[PDB]
Structure formats: structure tokens, C-alpha cells
Amino acid sequence: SLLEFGKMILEETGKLAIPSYSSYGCYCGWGGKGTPKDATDRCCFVHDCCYGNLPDCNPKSDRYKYKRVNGAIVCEKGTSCENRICECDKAAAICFRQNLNTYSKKYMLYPDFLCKGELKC
Amino acid sequence: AIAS
């Protein structure tokens, strides 16, 4: 659930998922169109695509479990949806980590109209 | 609230 994806992001990036990745670029937090502005935005785009593959699950509210084995995120057995959801988040978090170096503040609170273009998953 |  959103509580876990959040905590996952913090451990990983030391950034509060709430400011930092809730209104970044075109796909971070809401968002449903245009061209990702950068890596981090690409990450969100993929994450959003990842959820797209689970039509009958509920990402934002279904909770799951995960442990860390030396920092390695490990999704634990739960429901089919929960496992799959946990995997999708896991990826996003790593993605975020991997692009911290390009995180740009100018992409926080990005205006909607600047998100032009089309992109398929 | 929410994350991505």
C-alpha cells in the first residue's frame, strides 16, 4: 500500500516520498500523460505501467510485507496481488535510487500543460 | 497521502 511504497522510498533514497516524488515531472504522483521529463519521471512512468498490469488489484490500499536481507528488498509471500504489487514498488524504489544523481528540483510541482506527447506502456 |  501507499504506506509501504513510501517507507520503501525513504530507506532507499533518504527522501520523503511525500514531497519529493508526489508531484515530480509528468508521472510522479498522479499523472497520466505526456513524455517523461527524466529518468526519475521514467521510473514513475514504468511504475504506473506496472500497476496497469494488475487491473483487479488495489495498489494504493492493499498492504504487503517485505524484509531486507542486507539492504536487498525482499517481497514476502502474501496474496497474488500483494506479491505482484510489492514487486512493482520494489522496482520503482531501485529506479529512484539509481537516478538520485539526476533528480532535479525544477521538476517538483510541474504544471500539467507542460506534459505533452503520447507514450504507450 | 500518496508516493508514485
- CATH number at A120 reads 1.20.90.10
What letters, b where the CB count within 10 A reaches 16 and e where it falls short, cover A99-111?
beeebeeebeebe
Method: X-ray
The residue among A56, A37, A53 whose CA lies nearest residue A119 is A37
> CA B3 to CA A3: how far, in whole Å?
8
Residue A30 CA neighbour count, 13 Å, CB half: 13
Contacts of B4 in chain A (CB under 8 A): 5, 21, 27-29, 43-44, 47-48, 92
- Phi, psi dihedral angles at A109 (to 5 degrees): 55, 40
- d(CA B2, nearest CA chain A) in Å: 6
Whether the CB-CB separation of A91 and A50 falls below 8 Å is answered with yes
Resolution of this deposited model, Å:
2.8
Residue A47 known to be catalytic: yes
What letters, b where the CB count within 10 A reaches 16 and e where it falls short, cover A40-60?
bbbbbbbbbebbeeeeebebe
* A29 annotated ligand binder: yes
- Number of domains composing chain A: 1
Range of the domain at A3: 1-121
> CA A117 to CA A10: how far, in whole Å?
31
Q: Does A9 touch chain B (CB under 8 A)?
A: yes
Residue A38 known to be catalytic: no
**Bridge partner list, A73:** A68
